[PDB]
Amino acid sequence: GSDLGKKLLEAARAGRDDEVRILMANGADVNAADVVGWTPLHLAAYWGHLEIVEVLLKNGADVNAYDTLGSTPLHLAAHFGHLEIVEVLLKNGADVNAKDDNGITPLHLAANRGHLEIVEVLLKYGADVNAQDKFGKTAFDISINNGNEDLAEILQ
Amino acid sequence: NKFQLTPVDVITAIKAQNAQVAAGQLGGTPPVKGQQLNASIIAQTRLT
Amino acid sequence: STEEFGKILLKVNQDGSRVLLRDVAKIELGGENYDIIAEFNGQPASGL
Amino acid sequence: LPAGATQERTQKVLNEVTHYYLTKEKNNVESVFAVNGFGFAGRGQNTG
């Protein structure tokens, strides 16, 4: 319950790159968490603030930090098409096969929204193509259900 | 009682068999090219 | 989207296969009604 | 058009009417707004 921790969370969400840098120098906790378990790196990934993702990882932020439902920055980045952020997270040792409480992986979420570029990068970093969610669904199954043939070809 | 029926069955039967049904048209829109005939389709009408 | 309407799961077969809405229907954005065709010098038109 | 006449048949006649005004009255007419399926006597596929 640190004041500077709450400011960083709000600052990293709105995309204040310079205010982050200042709060980092002032000694604000990089791994401060919401009520729902979101860190600044969660928010930066979700809203697509690349520089802040790079700045937070440079100041020793947990790249594999997980929320109360088991979702990581990579889950959010991969889901909502932030390709540049997916590359940076994976370059800083992000768990490519991270399972949320539903057994959903970055590859599932990327496949769900038909982000071909992100899917191909996740596969390059060794994403388990046969990984099943709690319902036994693979990325390929998701692609077939959505009628995405281009994406189905890649996972076959 | 003799036919194992109640007022519910009577009401249900009346709503079904005393009905005004919208049934579209022959050659209705949007049609196929070359269609020769356009005609209203008449199904069940109210009893008189 | 037409995609989301296409994914509507109508039933699961005994063998375990899926019948989606797009397996029994074509899915497109169209008019509420097709009973009026408007043109302006031969080309398609709407208006107020 | 006569009874049972289709949208397509009515569109051929409106095209003849449109073409005439943009041809034989080219000097007088600016545009023709053709409406298939509405008349003052009534509406349907056989009116324009």
Dump the DSSP string for A23-62: HHHHT--TT---SS---HHHHHHHHT-HHHHHHHHHTT--
Residue C6 parent element (H or E)? helix C2-6
Alpha-carbon C44 to chain mean position: 21
Within 13 Å of residue A124, how many CA atoms lie on the same side as its CB?
Answer: 10
Q: Residue D31 is nearest to which of C35, C37, C40, comparing CB atoms?
A: C40
The verdict on C33 touching B (C-beta cutoff 8 Å) is: yes
Q: How far is C44 from chain B (nearest CA, A)?
A: 15
Query: Which residues in chain C have their CB less than 8 angstroms from residue A145's CB?
Result: 7, 18, 20
Tokens of B40: 């209203």
Residue A65 carries which side chain, given as an amino acid letter? A
Specify the long-range contacts of residues D12-18, CB closer than 8 Å, at least 24 apart. D13/D48, D14/C39, D14/D48, D15/C42, D18/C39, D18/C41, D18/C42
Question: How many Å apart are CA A23 and CA A5, to the nearest integer?
Answer: 9
Question: How many Å apart are CA B6 and CA B12, to the nearest integer?
Answer: 10
Within 13 Å of residue D35, how many CA atoms lie on the same side as its CB?
Answer: 8
Q: How many residues does chain C have?
A: 48
DSSP B28: P
State the residue for tokens 């038109």. Answer: C45
Q: How far is B32 from chain C (nearest CA, A)?
A: 12
Query: Which residues in chain B have their CB less than 8 angstroms from residue C32's CB?
Result: none
Taking chain C, what is the end-to-end CA distance rounded to the nearest angstrom? 27
Tokens of A89: 């997270």
Q: Computed from CA positions of residues B2, B7, B13, B18, in that sequence, does the dihedral angle turn out positive or negative?
A: positive
How many other C-beta atoms lie within 10 A of the C-beta of residue A87?
18
The verdict on B40 touching C (C-beta cutoff 8 Å) is: no
Closest alpha carbon within chain B to D4:
B38
Question: How many Å apart are CA A103 and CA A94, to the nearest integer?
Answer: 17
Question: How many Å apart are CA A82 and CA C19, to the nearest integer?
Answer: 34
Question: How many Å apart are CA B32 and CA D5, to the nearest integer?
Answer: 14
CB crowding C17-33: b at 16 or more within 10 Å, else e: eeebebeeeeeeeeeee
Q: Residue A106, preceding bond cis, omega within 30 degrees?
A: no
Closest alpha carbon within chain B to C36:
B29
A to C contact (≥3 Cβ pairs closer than 8 Å): yes
Elucidation technique = X-ray
Alpha-carbon D17 to chain mean position: 6
SS3 A110: helix
Query: Which residues in chain C have their CB less than 8 angstroms from residue A137's CB?
Result: none
Helix ranges (H only) for A64-148 are 73-79, 83-91, 106-112, 116-124, 139-146
How many other C-beta atoms lie within 10 A of the C-beta of residue A2?
11
Say yes or no for a CB contact (<8 Å) between D35 and C41.
no
Q: How far is B48 from chain C (nearest CA, A)?
A: 31
What phi and psi values does residue C19 have, to the nearest 5 degrees? Answer: -105, 100
Calculate helix-pair angle for A116-124, A83-91, nearest 10 degrees.
10
Within 13 Å of residue B32, how many CA atoms lie on the same side as its CB?
Answer: 5
Question: How many Å apart are CA B30 and CA D1, to the nearest integer?
Answer: 19
How many other C-beta atoms lie within 10 A of the C-beta of residue B30?
11
The verdict on B22 touching D (C-beta cutoff 8 Å) is: no
Angle at A78 between CA A34 and CA A131, to 5 degrees: 105
| Alpha-carbon separation of residue A40 from A13, A14, A95, B27, D28 (angstroms) | 7, 10, 18, 62, 70
Mutating which of B35, B38, B40, B41 best tests the D interface, going by the most D Cβ atoms within 10 A?
B38
Angle at C41 between CA C38 and CA C43, to 5 degrees: 60
CB crowding A58-72: b at 16 or more within 10 Å, else e: eeebebebbbeeebb
Q: Computed from CA positions of residues D24, D25, D31, D33, in that sequence, does the dihedral angle turn out positive or negative?
A: negative
Q: Computed from CA positions of residues A29, A33, A34, A38, in that sequence, does the dihedral angle turn out positive or negative?
A: positive
Question: How many Å apart are CA C37 and CA D48, to the nearest integer?
Answer: 9
Closest alpha carbon within chain C to D8:
C37
Residues whose CB is less than 8 angstroms from the CB of residue A142 and which lie 6 or more positions away in sequence, other chains included? A108, A111, A112
The secondary structure of D1-48, three-state, reads CCCCCCHHHHHHHHHHHHHHHCCCCCCCCCCCEEEECECCCCECCCCC
- Partner residues linked to C12 by β-bridges: C18
Residues whose CB is less than 8 angstroms from the CB of residue A66 and which lie 6 or more positions away in sequence, other chains included? A37, A72, A98, A100
State the residue for tokens 């899917």. Answer: A119
Question: What is the resolution of the experimental data for this entry, in Å?
Answer: 2.8
